Amino acid sequence: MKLAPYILELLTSVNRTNGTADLLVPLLRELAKGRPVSRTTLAGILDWPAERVAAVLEQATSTEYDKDGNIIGYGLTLRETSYVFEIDDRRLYAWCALDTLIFPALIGRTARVSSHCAATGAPVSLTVSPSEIQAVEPAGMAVSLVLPQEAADVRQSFCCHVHFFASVPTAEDWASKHQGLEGLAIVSVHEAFGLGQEFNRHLLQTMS
Ligand SMILES: [Hg+2]
Known part of the structure; x- marks a missing residue:
């Protein structure tokens, strides 16, 4: 249960260059509107030249773009994954279970999260607000964690092993x-939500 x-x-792998955290939060908030995000929109929000935005994103290897070259995925995504993340009337997705617990606090909005147990296939869902989780179904829901790798692509090294499960015993058997x-x-x-909170606290402290 030592989570440091x-x-x-995770901080090291996410924080590749300066401005990443400054860029990430506004990016998440834009993506949360359910439409592709242009680099110019980011530039305007941040007061950066688009060239600098491009520099930051270049380092974020796993960033997803659409056919127009607009940003559609960075932790939160418009491309379908196993982790559905809904804000208002917009269905978005997330790269992994832990992301779904972390993003609502960064976006400042409550999300309806749904997925399936990675071991049994059973539907799982909960409501995640910036301060708490509610309507956890089933109530004993669990999350798998692995140690992120610093220089590797975060999705292949971390996200793809971080799932929801129906219960702790089920997950431990898995x-x-x-x-x-x-x-x-x-x-x-x-416990995973509490992990997300500490992560967010440290991440936000690095903002300008
Ligand atoms: Hg992730």
Whole structure:
């Protein structure tokens, strides 16, 4: 239940260059409107030249673009994933279970989150607000964690192993067949949410 290593490594992998955190929050808030985000829109919000925005994103290897070259994915995405993340009347998606717990606080909006247990396929859902989770169904929902790798693409090294599960026992049974996953751990969705809070606290402190 010692979570500092996860926080530290996730911060290091997310914070590739200066301005990343300054860029990320407004980007998330724009994406949350459910439409592709142009680099010029970001430039305007931030008061940066579009050239600088381009510089930041260049380092964010996993960033998803549409056929128009607009941003459609950076943690929160318009491209379908296993993690549905709805704000108001807009269906968005997230790259992993932990993202769904972290983003509402950064966006400042409540999200309806839904997915399926990675071990059993059972539907899972909850409401995530910037301060708390509610309507956790099933109530014993769990999350898998692994240790992020600093220089690797965050999706292939972290996101793809961070799932929701129907319960802790179910997830632990699943985990027994997943050795070599560095720092693989099962926590309750509540502990994962608390992890997200500490992550956010450290991330926001690095903003201008
Ligand atoms: Hg993720």
